[PDB]
Design a protein around this nucleic acid. Structure first.
Ligand SMILES: N[C@@H](Cc1c[nH]c2ccccc12)C(=O)O
Ligand SMILES: N[C@@H](Cc1c[nH]c2ccccc12)C(=O)O
Ligand SMILES: N[C@@H](Cc1c[nH]c2ccccc12)C(=O)O
Ligand SMILES: N[C@@H](Cc1c[nH]c2ccccc12)C(=O)O
Lengths: 387, 387
RNA sequence: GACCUCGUGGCGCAAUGGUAGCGCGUCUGACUCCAGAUCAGAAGGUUGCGUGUUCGAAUCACGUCGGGGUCA
RNA sequence: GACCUCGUGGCGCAAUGGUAGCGCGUCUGACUCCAGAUCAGAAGGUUGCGUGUUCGAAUCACGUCGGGGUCA
């Protein structure tokens, strides 16, 4: 019995979360082959590997989004981030990497939310500190290549006070969610502060277009698509239930699996936990070390046993990371084959990984460094977005 | 055992609420003669009759406000209103009448809050309807003579989205109040909506100057004074407890007694209840009728018994209303004397009342009619206030 | 997503198959200098909505809207 | 406003008057192609803050800050 909620991914199996069980448990829908070819037919583009490889595996109302898109009816993307301190590891990238692709292939506007107020309520920092962390994380997000002409990155602490329609939708949503409702959904108790208790309303507000008057004037019927880590589904199950009751459309969803922590898929990568993560501000040596010194293996103890029994892929953190970052499907297969056959040793694998991580993480740093203050401020300026 | 909270004033005694017991029960301070002369010494003005006659009877930190004022340290007024539909009776005026005086004699800026979002959560209407009711009630408030150069009337639904510091203080406050805290203070249950559960934070935010950046830039140490009906003390007991913990000063308070309902001081006047109120949009005949047909009497049944036993003032709604609106202290005394002695009959009294109500309510209508849309919009424009 | 529950004159209750009643309130006249109190009388709902079963339903069933609760 | 309660190495616990210990975690070497597992060793806190009582306090008292609870 795996446990998954907005603040905890914990399972006993080394193979990690049983996503098939998660889909059922949550009521979401499995993304099947049909849906994928259906996505390709609509974009005229080859499905991103996260879709091919089941990284993004679950959805909600996707066919309706496609049915609309295909019929010239526009949708907009909405995803977000809880601002961090120094953190921001590769795991935090998956959703954003996919969102950038979705933005390209479908050519649609996007709103990214920086829940600095959330952190302020959950962690121990000042609004300035929280807001700061956000404007900062903005760089890394921007560094993913989001089109500045179709992307609006905002901080709750800020935008809330400069929008004639966001707080208005928070009030609507709040009126339609009870303390009992969220007590169940998230697990809040009478002891939690009123601020945490009503925060869900805020993570839901972006699902409704008229929350962004300067981007959609006051249109209240524009489809919304939320790419995100399955652990965020709770907010939007709630959002989908509130939607009709206040006369707005339900946000569609594309769910992604968690990026396994270095010590094993028993949990997801996280800045809070020791050596479990590879940060976006990591030197090629640090990247190299962490992989050689912390990545859990599915390979046999000795070169001896490994040759006669090969390694196990269902648990090899290194092989898992490759499933996420090695583009070429042929190379990933060769490795899976050889590693399984014993033909390849764990270290030869750990090396293949580091060869793909270092350059990726390096490029990120390279693009991050090109993010000027003028730019950040632009992305973060309520303004009309293209399309 | 009288019962008083933000939504209910109920007592069994015809003499109404035992305010002395209320002060103790709430922990507030009785406004004694000293404090009154102290107010006169500071303003160089004769204390308003609400103070002379105990209408405004309780306070919190008033001496500190005076100590500061007298030493050239400025404070600002903050009071508010839950927007109504057609309502707005004389009872709703007391606080505002006194606030206008305080504004004059002390010469200080003022923020008036229109909790349209509160109504939206508690009643059954649309945000437009709620916002509308507010912009409307604004007229009647303005009609009280508040200096447009020192007064800012705002609606939560609106201002919240155009302030770089209000929502910021709501977030601070929310983090420092638990669901249990407000469950106790107000009586909210797990069934109430998250919006009602965290609303108190909003009625508290105006107590802090930096909530109004366009009026006080980002000063966080400006004394605040809240004139209000004692039934609102719960929000500010809570506000005073949260204040220091977030590094802001505690709001001072001036409490006023309730305006007794026509049928008797057992409850306060209210639009919800039948014939218990006299509306600001009432014809001289309606005013006249309500008083002759509904005002509870303390006079004897027949002219006979009344002459030998006189009337009772501790329960006569009409005499109570006069205590509120008859300026001249000598006339009020003559009436109290004669009515008690039997020298005057109840109807002669009911007549004296109507003679003071009709002209007052008439003037209000007269000034309300002069409130142009340009003006309302002005009062409601975040802008620098004089002093 | 599924499940439970409620939905009736302004308010609070009743009539679990064959004509929707009561209390509070609201209005009248009597009585009082008024008001209250006390007497006497009256007005007000096709039962959230749409069907269906039935000779006939508020009550039975399906659907739907809305409030509250609950589940992996 | 008053009252109760807690506050200790990153985490989670202990020592209710006379020298702050343990577990988890973190680092080393052994072992493994790595990692994990298993062995062997080590580093890390003057106990929210300020006093006071005492020969001596984390533990007692006063004050104060912060978390949680409670009252008319
Ligand atoms: N609460 C999320 C941040 C977030 C806000 N809105 C979102 C929409 C999609 C995904 C994530 C988000 C986090 O901690 O990462
Ligand atoms: N373009 C990369 C995404 C990416 C950006 N920055 C990164 C840093 C590390 C790994 C991947 C990335 C991809 O398709 O996967
Ligand atoms: N909630 C109060 C309105 C209000 C808001 N802020 C205030 C400050 C003082 C007095 C009243 C208020 C009411 O219903 O009337
Ligand atoms: N100026 C009046 C206040 C007031 C304004 N409008 C009113 C309407 C009815 C009664 C009083 C008023 C006073 O001093 O009491």
């Amino acid at each position: 019995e795996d446990f998954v909620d907005p603040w905890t991914v914990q399972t006993s199996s080394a193979k990690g979360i049983d996503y098939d069980k998660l889909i059922v448990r949550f009521g979401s829908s499995k993304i099947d082959k049909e849906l994928i070819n259906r996505i390709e037919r609509a974009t005229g583009q080859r499905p991103h590997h996260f879709l091919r490889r089941g990284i993004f595996f679950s959805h909600r109302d996707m066919n309706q989004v496609l049915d609309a898109y295909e019929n010239k009816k526009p949708f907009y993307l909405y995803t977000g981030r809880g601002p961090s301190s120094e953190a921001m590891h590769v795991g935090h990238l998956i959703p954003f990497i996919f969102t950038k692709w979705l933005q390209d292939v479908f050519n649609v506007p996007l709103v990214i939310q920086m829940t600095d107020d959330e952190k302020y309520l959950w962690k121990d920092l000042t609004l300035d500190q929280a807001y700061g962390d956000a404007v900062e994380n903005a760089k890394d997000i921007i560094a993913c290549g989001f089109d500045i002409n179709k992307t609006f990155i905002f901080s709750d602490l800020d935008y809330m006070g400069m929008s004639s329609g966001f707080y208005k939708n928070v009030v609507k949503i709040q009126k339609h969610v009870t303390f009992n409702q969220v007590k169940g959904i998230f697990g809040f108790t009478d002891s939690d502060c009123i601020g945490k208790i009503s925060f869900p309303a805020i993570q839901a507000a972006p699902s409704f277009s008229n929350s962004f008057p300067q981007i959609f004037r006051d249109r209240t019927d524009i489809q919304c698509l939320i790419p995100c880590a399955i652990d965020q589904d709770p907010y939007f199950r709630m959002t989908r239930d509130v939607a009709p009751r206040i006369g707005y459309p339900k946000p569609a969803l594309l769910h992604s699996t968690f990026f396994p922590a270095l010590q094993g898929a028993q949990t997801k990568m996280s800045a809070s936990d020791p050596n479990s993560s590879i940060f976006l501000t990591d030197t090629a040596k640090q990247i190299k070390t962490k992989v050689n010194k912390h990545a859990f293996s599915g390979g046999r103890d000795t070169i001896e046993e490994h040759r006669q029994f090969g390694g196990n892929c269902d648990v090899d953190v290194s092989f898992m990371y490759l499933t996420f970052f090695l583009e070429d499907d042929d190379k990933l297969e060769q490795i899976r084959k050889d590693y399984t056959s014993g033909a390849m040793l764990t270290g030869e694998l750990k090396k293949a990984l580091i060869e793909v991580l270092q350059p990726l993480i390096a490029e990120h740093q390279a693009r991050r460094k090109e993010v000027t203050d003028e730019i950040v401020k632009e992305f973060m300026t309520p303004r009309k977005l293209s399309f």
